[PDB]
Amino acid sequence: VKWPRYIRLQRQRAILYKRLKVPPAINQFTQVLDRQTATQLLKLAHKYRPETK
């Protein structure tokens, strides 16, 4: 499909983040917390949520 130019842009930007040599300061955010640790951290942080208005 001839995609729109914004769809083309936001896809091939991610292609460039796969291509270019990403420095480690920006690389460290693709190494992320795995799923069964993230869900127990969120069920801990659900206890301490700030107050609704």
Partner: protein, 203 residues
């Protein structure tokens, strides 16, 4: 606070973190169009120290001025006159490309007012500037006392009288002994005060 780290991080620009960031942003900004709205500032600390408080009614644009000097807009060669004014190709323009950026941003939006602007990227053939714009007839702007100065008719199109910071850098003013040819209101006012006979009544 985070903004101190953000300003020192933006200060280090040949650091490969910031070379990667400015390169990828500049790629994306060339793929985009010339005068398009940015949804939020790219440099929030620079925006906040130039005047942007992230409330309703402030608008960031992201504009692309084409990079280069200024060749003289004459037919083929042919400036018909004395050999001082023969030159066309190596001429430079009196105002910064940052000011030209604020100018065409505030021309494209005439209902808004150019607060200030900053730098985001460059390459060989374009420079990119993000412009801060205040909508004066919004009431979060009009009911706040220390920003309802923008809502007055004197401040109409600041970028074209040359009153934002990128325009003030090109008028040659400021205190000093370096700035004698603007004393008075401006350079033209200096010249006009100097080249008039004050022919008194009693001489």
């Amino acid at each position: 606070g985070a903004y101190k780290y953000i300003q020192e991080l933006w200060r280090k620009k040949q650091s490969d973190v910031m070379r990667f960031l400015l390169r990828v942003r500049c790629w994306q900004y060339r793929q985009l169009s010339a005068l398009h709205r940015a949804p939020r500032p790219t440099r929030p600390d620079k925006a906040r120290r130039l005047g942007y408080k992230a409330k309703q009614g402030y608008v960031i644009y992201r504009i692309r001025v084409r990079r280069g000097g200024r060749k003289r807009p004459v037919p083929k060669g042919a400036t018909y006159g004395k050999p001082v004014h023969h030159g066309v190709n190596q001429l430079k323009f009196a105002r910064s490309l940052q000011s030209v950026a604020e100018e065409r941003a505030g021309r494209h939006c005439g209902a808004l007012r150019v607060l200030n602007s900053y730098w985001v990227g460059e390459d060989s053939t374009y420079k990119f500037f993000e412009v801060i714009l205040i909508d004066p007839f919004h009431k979060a702007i009009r009911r706040n006392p220390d920003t309802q100065w923008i809502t007055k008719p004197v401040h109409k199109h600041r970028e074209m009288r040359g009153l934002t910071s990128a325009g003030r850098k090109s008028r040659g003013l400021g205190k000093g002994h370096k700035f004698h040819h603007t004393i008075g209101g401006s350079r033209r006012a200096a010249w006009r005060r100097r080249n008039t006979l004050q022919l008194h009544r009693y001489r």
